[PDB]
């Protein structure tokens, strides 16, 4: 099977440069052109450029000429895209796609296939920061933990070291103007058990090596 | 020159839905249109190439039509797996490169559910940190579209508001979150604050006040 594997997510400061890879398998690497596109959040896909891996000649969109370089490594069957002078507007998911080209006999265009899984590149001036965790208190009752002011994603939240799973619901985070993320996790608990039972949320932020255990209780 | 495509489309399972794609002489008029299924957590999947041709693995449901500068993707017999993003793609001669449609989010329609709203006032710890955050949590609503408003003594509040995009939930309903950041002086200066959640023309409101 023909598969295009693509490198993991990147976090870069403004003005820096990023180099995303695209490893190819399942087909003759030099017999199909490679395309690079990007999609900013809430935006349509934007074509960037394309290359013939057989000979290495590459062409680029007008909006990206002078900032993007598309290259390839035949021995590794890998195509590379390097974007320079990054800004906040360059935050997007970057994808590589194989160009199946035209069938000579039928004249049909065979489409762009397959596609890489994408690479999220975040260009943010913020630096790595662990979260601040605050308790959230009000038939039944709802208790929660406010995971505030962290960067970057993701944060894992668990309750009572994984023992409590029923009634747990962790919302996706928001990106506020400070450049930091914030999410909440809540648990629905019987009102009678409020006071007797104890509920501890476990927060793990791998990028900052932060582990926080905060018990939530009614005020 | 870009490809114009409707923002959203929806229908109940088993029905037929059509997604339009508008172009110009330089992209669709002279070149072929290609259709892609873009799942939320997967690479785009080719559905139609050369304006009507489908790959081996694409079912009979998906079909494509072309007329001049316009194109259309028809999906018949909708299924739950078909809920994804669909975008058209075509070469543009002026750009000398590919151009893409904006994408049409296709949702296959369970019955409507009013949102459950819970509003948390800032904790005493956060206030002691010289910060204040109101947390408005929206859960178990369908379809996934919410309007969030914030009120301070019945007057609207616009600044310091950050609302998340709706997300899918385990029960196939939708969830959203809105945060209102403010100073402890602002929190203590007003009698109460309110979060108003509008869904399908109906509003649900919650209110919190400083404790003393």
């Amino acid at each position: 099977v023909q598969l295009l594997e693509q490198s993991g997510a990147e976090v870069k400061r403004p003005g820096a440069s990023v180099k995303v890879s695209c490893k190819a398998s399942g087909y003759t690497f030099t017999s199909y052109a490679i395309h690079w596109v990007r999609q900013a959040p809430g935006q349509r896909l934007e074509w960037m450029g394309w290359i013939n891996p057989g000979n290495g000649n590459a062409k680029y969109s007008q909006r990206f000429q002078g900032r993007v370089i598309i290259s390839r490594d035949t021995s590794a069957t890998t195509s590379y895209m390097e974007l320079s002078s990054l800004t906040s507007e360059d935050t997007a998911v970057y994808s590589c796609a194989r160009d199946r080209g035209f069938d000579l006999l039928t004249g049909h265009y065979l489409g762009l296939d397959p596609w890489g899984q994408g690479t999220l590149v975040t260009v943010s001036s913020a630096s790595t920061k662990g979260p601040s965790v605050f308790p959230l208190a009000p038939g039944t009752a709802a208790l929660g933990c406010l995971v505030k002011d962290y960067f970057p994603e993701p944060v894992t939240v668990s309750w009572n070291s994984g023992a409590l799973t029923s009634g747990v619901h962790t919302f996706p985070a928001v990106l506020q103007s400070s450049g930091l993320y914030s999410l909440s996790s809540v648990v629905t608990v019987p009102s009678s058990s409020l006071g007797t039972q104890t509920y501890i949320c476990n927060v793990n932020h791998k990028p900052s090596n932060t582990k926080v255990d905060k018990k939530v209780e009614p005020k | 020159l870009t490809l114009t495509q409707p923002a959203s489309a929806s229908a109940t399972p088993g029905q037929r839905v059509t997604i339009s794609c508008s172009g110009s002489s330089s992209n669709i008029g002279g070149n072929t249109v290609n259709w892609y299924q873009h799942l939320p957590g997967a690479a785009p999947k080719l559905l139609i190439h050369n304006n009507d041709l489908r790959p081996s693995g694409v079912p009979d449901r998906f079909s494509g039509s072309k007329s001049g500068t316009s194109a259309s993707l028809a999906v018949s017999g909708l299924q739950s797996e078909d809920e994804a993003d669909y975008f058209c793609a075509a070469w543009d001669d002026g750009l000398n490169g590919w151009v893409f449609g904006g994408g049409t989010k296709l949702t296959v329609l369970q019955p409507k559910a009013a949102p459950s709203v819970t509003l948390f006032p800032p904790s005493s710890e956060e206030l002691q940190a010289n910060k204040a955050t109101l947390v408005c949590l929206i859960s178990d609503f369908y379809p996934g579209a919410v309007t969030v408003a914030w009120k301070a003594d019945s007057s609207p509040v616009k600044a310091g508001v950050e609302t998340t995009t709706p997300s899918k939930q385990s029960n196939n309903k939708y969830a959203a979150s809105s945060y209102l950041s403010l100073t402890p002086e602002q929190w203590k200066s007003h009698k109460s604050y309110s979060c108003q959640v509008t869904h399908e023309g109906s509003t649900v409101e919650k209110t919190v006040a400083p404790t003393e």
């Binding site: 052109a33 394309w50 057989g54 000649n57 035209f102 004249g107 | 330089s26 001669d93 002026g94 000398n96």
Partner: peptide
Amino acid sequence: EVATPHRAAWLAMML
């Protein structure tokens, strides 16, 4: 820099 059709552009790239 010059408007080239999709088939023409594909042939030029792949020689």
